[PDB]
Design an enzyme around this catalytic site. Structure first.
Site, PDB file in Angstrom:
ATOM      1  N   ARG A  89       6.541  25.814 -80.384  1.00  0.00           N
ATOM      2  CA  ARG A  89       5.746  25.773 -79.171  1.00  0.00           C
ATOM      3  C   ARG A  89       4.753  24.629 -79.150  1.00  0.00           C
ATOM      4  O   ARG A  89       4.302  24.146 -80.193  1.00  0.00           O
ATOM      5  CB  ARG A  89       5.040  27.104 -78.934  1.00  0.00           C
ATOM      6  CG  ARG A  89       5.985  28.210 -78.488  1.00  0.00           C
ATOM      7  CD  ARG A  89       5.227  29.424 -78.032  1.00  0.00           C
ATOM      8  NE  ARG A  89       6.139  30.441 -77.519  1.00  0.00           N
ATOM      9  CZ  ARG A  89       6.717  30.388 -76.325  1.00  0.00           C
ATOM     10  NH1 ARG A  89       6.472  29.375 -75.503  1.00  0.00           N
ATOM     11  NH2 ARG A  89       7.532  31.359 -75.945  1.00  0.00           N
ATOM     12  N   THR A 141      18.771  37.938 -70.156  1.00  0.00           N
ATOM     13  CA  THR A 141      18.055  36.718 -69.729  1.00  0.00           C
ATOM     14  C   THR A 141      18.446  36.083 -68.397  1.00  0.00           C
ATOM     15  O   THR A 141      19.547  35.549 -68.236  1.00  0.00           O
ATOM     16  CB  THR A 141      17.942  35.670 -70.860  1.00  0.00           C
ATOM     17  OG1 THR A 141      17.334  36.297 -71.992  1.00  0.00           O
ATOM     18  CG2 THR A 141      17.080  34.497 -70.441  1.00  0.00           C
ATOM     19  N   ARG A 162      10.919  47.012 -74.116  1.00  0.00           N
ATOM     20  CA  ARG A 162      10.923  45.894 -75.075  1.00  0.00           C
ATOM     21  C   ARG A 162       9.551  45.213 -75.225  1.00  0.00           C
ATOM     22  O   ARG A 162       8.979  44.768 -74.232  1.00  0.00           O
ATOM     23  CB  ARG A 162      11.971  44.854 -74.645  1.00  0.00           C
ATOM     24  CG  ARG A 162      11.967  43.544 -75.452  1.00  0.00           C
ATOM     25  CD  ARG A 162      12.887  42.532 -74.804  1.00  0.00           C
ATOM     26  NE  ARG A 162      12.882  41.238 -75.483  1.00  0.00           N
ATOM     27  CZ  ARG A 162      12.382  40.114 -74.974  1.00  0.00           C
ATOM     28  NH1 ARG A 162      11.828  40.095 -73.767  1.00  0.00           N
ATOM     29  NH2 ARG A 162      12.445  39.005 -75.666  1.00  0.00           N
ATOM     30  N   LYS A 194      19.790  38.524 -82.455  1.00  0.00           N
ATOM     31  CA  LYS A 194      19.776  37.725 -81.234  1.00  0.00           C
ATOM     32  C   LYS A 194      20.515  36.408 -81.437  1.00  0.00           C
ATOM     33  O   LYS A 194      20.091  35.581 -82.240  1.00  0.00           O
ATOM     34  CB  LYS A 194      18.337  37.493 -80.756  1.00  0.00           C
ATOM     35  CG  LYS A 194      17.739  38.700 -79.994  1.00  0.00           C
ATOM     36  CD  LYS A 194      16.258  38.528 -79.676  1.00  0.00           C
ATOM     37  CE  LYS A 194      15.978  37.228 -78.916  1.00  0.00           C
ATOM     38  NZ  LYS A 194      14.575  37.142 -78.422  1.00  0.00           N
TER      39      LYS A 194
HETATM   40  K   LIG Z   1      10.857  36.732 -78.621  1.00  0.00           K
HETATM   41 MN   LIG Z   2      14.981  33.310 -77.083  1.00  0.00          MN
END
Ligand SMILES: [K+]
Ligand SMILES: [Mn+2]
Ligand code: PRO
Ligand code: PRO
Ligand code: PRO
Ligand SMILES: [K+]
Ligand SMILES: [K+]
Ligand SMILES: [Mn+2]
Ligand SMILES: [Mn+2]
Ligand code: NA
Ligand code: NA
Ligand code: NA
Ligand code: NA
Lengths: 512, 521, 508
Positions: free
Chosen positions: B110, B318, B63, B260
């Site tokens: 961010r 995760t 990934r 996702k």
């Molecule tokens: K990402």
């Molecule tokens: Mn994420």
């Protein structure tokens, strides 16, 4: 409205399944439950057997409790003459099995005409062979010599299919009092529940009848009053080497038969719930328990089980059955009987064809009504200790048949084994089993859902071509029979190579 | 007695409770590992020599996380992956395909860089005032008093008393005052703030683009680099999937889109996302910040459930072996997390920091491998199979029928494997769907189909390099023996064992319509 | 409109449809059924800290006798009681708190940095027990050299370091290595260790527990039934009402679990040491099997160790720790445990609250209909009347979505039977037996309430009083309000040895 009770099929519970049964949900054309017909003076003619075959008959039963070898041989010949009247057309030909139903350790009365036995009025059981033909309301003779060594003070004797009953009051003779009365005929059967009868499982007559079955090339024996595995093995011994391939169907029709049921099953080839005598040997209110226990355990072992006797009784005299008789056939099919049977209804009744037709019709409605998904799951659970390769094929194929709602399953088989393992896992769709072995074809009738087809063609040099020959035969059979039409799907089961010891190859094929 | 392998005594339970009660630590698992293993590649795992050891440990999918790195960086990584992967190509029997996946940045929020003056990180203190700015003069001058972030339109989506989360949701701020171009906050949860840390606004409708200009370029670059799949970040609705699709275009049409799920909106609208997607990722990191952390397992289990029901690949992601970033061994919870995910029905499980930056990337990869086989055997297959059938029972599709028939037959004779000959992958995919316990050795000439197959529980892809034999019969047989040789070398089976072989009867078939039980030669 | 408490998923036909219906927008109920056991150490031992520990959800205080003196743990136990009794002015909202002694048992330990593939000398000589070095390490196991083989491995410090035995004193080769410290735990997996099951150091601690009025012992490294009978013998006559929770943490514990379960009053999956004794990839197998078998026999089971490990240093857990807690509740665990999290961590309060919040999400997400049906089937050979009444009450609670079950009990046994059959509604258990209420925290769903009133003249009056106290408690803690329905279990006459009466009663 989905056909074939498929809405009910989709249900989660048994309760739901039932709430969902629909009278406007047409059954399919195929009929999975085998029909066994006792042949006699109502049905013994070539002409009537043709119609019996057309009406649904798959197996013809010969009752060796009466009739000479001469008489039974002619009947056998009549059944075959009629069966072969359709031989020329391979697409419609129905094999028809011949069944030998033995006399076994029966107790019958003698000759008299008729006599009346009144409630309360004393009667005298005697064994003095001078009275064989001198029976009346005072004196009654039966052919069981050791009757005295086996019954107690206070024992019961049932006469004439259990209609008449007697209590033994004192002791080579018995003096009884009539408990339940009636009219007494000649050579009527006698039962001794609770008494442990010591007649041979196989008498001289039986031995000569069994040997005769061999000579007559019968396909199966219905063995009366089997009590234990050793009885089955005796019958097996007489049939011997020349008759090793005849199936022994054991008749469970007394308490001991039921007690020792697991062993009889193991030793036998299939079972018959012979409810007539069974309902006399044990309380009649208990018979359904045995029916259901037996059918269940036979399903579990994948061995043919036959529900018999009094299933459409009233039809001996009337053209339409009763509501109880209707329900009885359906429930026998819902219970999971591979075959259902007719006795008096076809042997001697006024409506033999009708009785056959009624069984055919009820079979289809109840076949669609089964809870196939749960039944499949439960049989899988029960057989889960086995890892058998053919069972794996059969389960995959059946599960495959459920998913895509296949119109049939096509099985190529010589021993019959591939077909039988497919049958035991209870698909809804018919099993068209093509075989070059005529006996296998005849014997296949013992298994729910197998529609046997005899292939007469020579073997082709190329395996694939010989295989395709046989599948196309079933394709043609399935279409003339209204099972499917061009563009439907069927499951097909074959050996990859000629040496394959089972149907190791499954396919989903469109019908051409 | 004999203790059966693969928890086979527990397999025969009639109830879920008895299945639990029959689980046996002395029931040795089989050698096949069915759960696909996805590894995030980073400084810890970028070298060619390390990638080879990642493959030998069980990596099926590398990934590339596009939230960080230039294209020059990722192209080098992708090269390294392929160099490592192809170093093994000399043995066709042993070679393992490796899939390449592009995880997009998406609408990320961010912070900036911490100023040079003072400590390396700052201390945000419980009860202290922190101002958030959009003034680009502070983008490299963040501290305890003033924090810069990159979401220029932040002021239009938060309110007074809104919560802003910072750094994997470890630090929380409450908005006390609103300015047109700024926010005055109070710290509720204190902590040490580094640079370029993740920001979440859970109670806000963020108007950032599902697919940004950066993502677009990133996607197009994905297409030019022949990646097998895209993990699309922050998918909220079906139209988000359609946009990624539009961008991948005609050239990237066989590229799989994995959506996702990481916000509330993605859980609310899951069905339309699933229909539109080729697969899903339970992207738990952000999900556990967006929705309450104590609720993630519900969403995880709902999703894995619904993708199993639909025959679509799902990935649990995760912090699964998080502690193994600095420790040689996982915690007991982490061990449980991997196993329960496999039990949930996850097709794939993933490693992030554990392979990207971690101290023990090989040990992390190895541990997922060992847990996956334990839980794979510990599944309640007979009940799983029955329930998947019931949910699909409105379908009468022919390949599902073949699939159900083959899996059923593998349960009954306890087949050592299912061999599947396939070009698009569909036939294999549909078998995988029905969850046999045996491995699915899929043989294909389509190289991409092989790499994509890792997304599906149990499929053990095998590239067939041989030319097409003239007689259809010999061409089928060739591809079976290959799977036979692969299987033996890989220790899945030996002579006298049984496999289920799924083939096409003739070249024309668009699916495997032939099933056989066959002994291994 | 979304039904609370995962009730749409509660109605699924299959396990898969249940999963597919799980709804994050379906709100849990207020009550929390999974008991929180909290290891008390330097971080949690103060009275003020302990009060918030109880407020946030602590039900059981665990003392770890692997470390510390009798004087130290007595102070801790003293502070637990002070904190607990600071709430006693309100018998309505007062929460009983139980005290558990967790025995050292047969530990091996080091004395006072290791490179991979480096040779290390293990010695038993008591001349080195304070100067442990790179090349010379001392431990307290005397028989060791008789129980280990050439090739067998020895693990140090929570199984972090690995060393393979090469020669018999013991010379070893390090495999896995890290920073080594003072008095670090040693494990010898698959080598049958013959240290006394209950040492002198144990028999002193166990006697201390009796004197200290503890309610339950957590007996470390329980290997067989015999071992429980030993702890049982030590506790003697004075300590007969103290429950014995056996700790499963080695291969034999699992191997012989059945005889252990029969001999014990409860079980702890002691995951830390278990994941060192057997391959860690196997731990979940033993956890689920054990919880299941305990569920079946209706004996309490605690899932333990590392459940929220990262919260030692962080305010929020990782997703793996979330997942673990919820699956532990879904597995069937009566109790969950915190160790380092509450003993030494930086955030012991937040760890309690997350177990609390995680619990209630997972408790609603259990598949109750299927769980009940499967427990009944497994217990079907039993025809015990309390069990009959319990099963009927739980069934009745499910059918009318009842807000609670109210159980009156002195031994606890009636409440214990209710819990066992896993209702989704809380079980308010009223008892005049202070120790009964403390031990009740071991059972799923049971919310013990102490009755401090004297036994009434009329038996019926005494029943109403106890039932009304249970209504009052429920209404104060927002489990139910006026017009809600409750299942109420009581005895008909004073001498009944169980709750033979069941009612559907409205809440006034
Ligand atoms: K990402
Ligand atoms: Mn994420
Ligand atoms: O071929 C037939 O007609 C019957 C059907 C079931 C058994 N044999
Ligand atoms: O082939 C492999 O190694 C993995 C295992 C399942 C998915 N692909
Ligand atoms: O009373 C309480 O809060 C907890 C609930 C389960 C055991 N005790
Ligand atoms: K007969
Ligand atoms: K301890
Ligand atoms: Mn008879
Ligand atoms: Mn321990
Ligand atoms: Na055959
Ligand atoms: Na700085
Ligand atoms: Na295909
Ligand atoms: Na009681």
């Amino acid at each position: 409205i989905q056909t074939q009770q498929l809405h009910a099929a989709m249900a989660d519970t048994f309760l739901e399944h039932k709430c969902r049964l629909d009278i406007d949900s047409a059954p399919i054309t195929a009929r999975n439950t085998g029909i066994i017909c006792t042949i006699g003076p109502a049905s013994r003619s070539v002409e009537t057997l043709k119609e019996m075959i057309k009406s649904g008959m798959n197996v013809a039963r010969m009752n060796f409790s009466h009739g000479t070898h001469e008489y039974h041989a002619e009947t056998i010949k009549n059944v075959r003459t009629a069966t072969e009247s359709f031989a020329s057309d391979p697409i419609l030909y129905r094999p028809v099995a011949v069944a030998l139903d033995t006399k076994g350790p029966e107790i019958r009365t003698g000759l008299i005409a008729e006599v009346e036995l009144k409630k309360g009025a004393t009667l005298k059981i005697t064994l003095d062979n001078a009275y064989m033909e001198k029976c009346d309301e005072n004196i009654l003779w039966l052919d069981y010599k050791n009757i005295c060594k086996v019954v107690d003070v206070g024992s019961k004797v049932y006469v004439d299919d259990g209609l008449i009953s007697l209590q033994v009051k004192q002791k080579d003779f018995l003096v009884t009092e009539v408990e339940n009365g009636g009219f007494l005929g000649s050579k009527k059967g006698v039962n001794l529940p609770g008494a442990a009868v010591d007649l041979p499982a196989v008498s001289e007559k039986d031995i000569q009848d069994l040997k005769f079955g061999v000579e007559q090339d019968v396909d199966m024996v219905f063995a009366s009053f089997i009590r234990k595995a050793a009885d089955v093995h005796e019958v097996r011994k007489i049939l011997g080497e020349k008759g090793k391939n005849i199936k022994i169907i054991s008749k469970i029709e007394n308490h001991e038969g039921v007690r020792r049921f697991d062993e009889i099953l193991e030793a036998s080839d299939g079972i018959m719930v012979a409810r007539g005598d069974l309902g006399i040997e044990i309380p009649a209110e208990k018979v359904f328990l045995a029916q259901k226990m037996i059918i269940g355990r036979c399903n579990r072992a994948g061995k043919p089980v036959i529900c018999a006797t009094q299933m459409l009784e009233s039809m001996i005299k009337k053209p339409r059955p009763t509501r109880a008789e209707g329900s009885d056939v359906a429930n026998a099919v819902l219970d999971g009987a591979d075959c259902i049977m007719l006795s008096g209804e076809t042997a001697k009744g006024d409506y033999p064809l009708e009785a056959v037709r009624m069984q055919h019709l009820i079979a289809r409605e109840a076949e669609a009504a089964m809870f196939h998904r749960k039944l499949f799951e439960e049989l899988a659970r029960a057989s889960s200790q086995s890892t058998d390769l053919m069972e794996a094929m059969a389960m995959g194929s059946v599960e495959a048949s459920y998913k895509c709602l296949a119109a049939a399953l096509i099985v190529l088989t010589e021993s019959g084994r591939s077909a039988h393992q497919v049958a035991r896992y209870r698909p809804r769709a018919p099993i068209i089993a093509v075989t070059r072995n005529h006996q296998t074809a005849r014997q296949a009738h013992l298994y729910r859902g197998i529609f046997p087809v005899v292939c007469k063609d020579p073997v082709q040099e190329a395996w694939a071509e010989d295989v395709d020959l046989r599948v196309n035969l079933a394709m043609n059979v399935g279409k003339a029979r209204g099972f499917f039409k061009k563009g439907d799907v069927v499951i097909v089961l074959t050996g990859w190579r000629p040496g394959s010891g089972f149907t190791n190859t499954m396919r989903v094929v469109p019908v051409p």
